[PDB]
Design a protein around this ligand. Structure first.
Ligand SMILES: *[C@@H]1O[C@H](CO)[C@@H](O[C@@H]2O[C@H](CO)[C@@H](O[C@@H]3O[C@H](CO[C@@H]4O[C@H](CO[C@H]5O[C@H](CO)[C@@H](O)[C@H](O)[C@@H]5O)[C@@H](O)[C@H](O[C@H]5O[C@H](CO)[C@@H](O)[C@H](O)[C@@H]5O)[C@@H]4O)[C@@H](O)[C@H](O)[C@@H]3O)[C@H](O)[C@H]2NC(C)=O)[C@H](O)[C@H]1NC(C)=O
Ligand SMILES: *[C@@H]1O[C@H](CO)[C@@H](O)[C@H](O)[C@H]1NC(C)=O
Length: 233
């Protein structure tokens, strides 16, 4: 059994550089399956699709494998000044067109990109888990602010439409950050409000596993332990 990870710098090996790391690097210790971290810094559901990265996973994934997909951090912004990451606005079959990198690109909505990827994998017999994005430092201002982005609800909507599983990674990380407090959580963000230090990445990976155990996600089958702090919800 192999577990494929698709995400951005919050999940990727080496995080966003400068001594930060991604949560995907701390999962293997807790699973009895091989973990393949295909997350890449700076990608959105759009650019990950355009670069052929979902396709690459589709080529090698087999029946029984898992694929965890988590995007959102790089999916917003303005299409007016196209950075190549921003998805088309909307929750369904809306299409946007923008010239980027020498191509008049057809751009889909965030849910559509995730639904299309889920369909490719599911048809081959893989188990897909769509996960909401992790939060930027919620204590950046000295007080706790719970402010989910639109991509948290979109990931949930996508899983529902594609018929796959959903793990609310956002809520589980924000719940543990709230309890850890201001000083500790700020220490997890060494250079900006997005990229976690190795300790923050470990806490973020544990929060994903807490969410899996609490919700009864299929990944439960390859977990080596259920001893993680925090509570269900
Ligand atoms: C929530 O938790 C945070 C983190 O624990 C609390 O903030 C810390 O509070 C302690 C105690 O008050 C501060 O420690 C003091 O620091 C001063 C020196 O002044 C400061 O210098 C810091 C270092 O600067 C360098 O490093 C930075 C990081 O790499 C870099 O960005 C700089 O360019 C520079 O190279 C600096 O981080 C700090 O900035 C903060 O304060 C400014 C106030 O004017 C503000 O503009 C800025 O946005 C930051 O908030 C400040 O310049 C020492 O003289 C003193 O002895 C003591 O060690 C510590 O600096 C704070 N850290 C941070 C990250 O803010 C915070 O109080 C808690 N919030 C609440 C509401 O409780
Ligand atoms: C991109 O393609 C769409 C649909 O084919 C078209 O309407 C639009 O004008 C094209 N963009 C440019 C800059 O030509």
């Amino acid at each position: 059994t192999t577990v494929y990870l698709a995400g951005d710098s919050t999940m990727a090996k080496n995080g966003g550089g400068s001594g930060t790391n991604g949560w995907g690097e701390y999962l293997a210790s807790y699973l009895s399956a091989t973990v393949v971290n295909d997350a890449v810094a700076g990608r959105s559901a759009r650019s990950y699709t355009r670069e052929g990265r979902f396709e690459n996973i589709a080529d090698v994934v087999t029946a029984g494998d898992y694929v965890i997909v988590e995007f959102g951090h790089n999916d917003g912004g303005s299409l007016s000044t196209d950075n190549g990451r921003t998805d088309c606005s909307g929750t369904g079959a809306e299409v946007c067109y923008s010239v980027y990198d020498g191509v008049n690109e057809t751009i889909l909505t965030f849910p559509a990109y995730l639904e299309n990827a889920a369909k490719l994998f599911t048809a081959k017999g893989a188990k897909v888990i769509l996960s909401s994005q992790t939060p930027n430092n919620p204590w950046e201002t000295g007080t706790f602010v719970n402010s989910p982005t639109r991509f948290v609800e979109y990931a949930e909507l996508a899983a529902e439409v594609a018929g796959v599983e959903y793990v609310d990674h956002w809520s589980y990380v924000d719940s543990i950050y709230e309890t850890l407090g201001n000083a500790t959580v700020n220490s997890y963000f060494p250079i900006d409000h997005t990229h976690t230090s190795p300790a923050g990445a470990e806490v973020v990976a544990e929060a994903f596993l807490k969410a899996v155990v609490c919700t009864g996600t299929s990944l439960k089958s390859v977990l080596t332990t259920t001893s993680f702090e925090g509570t269900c919800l």
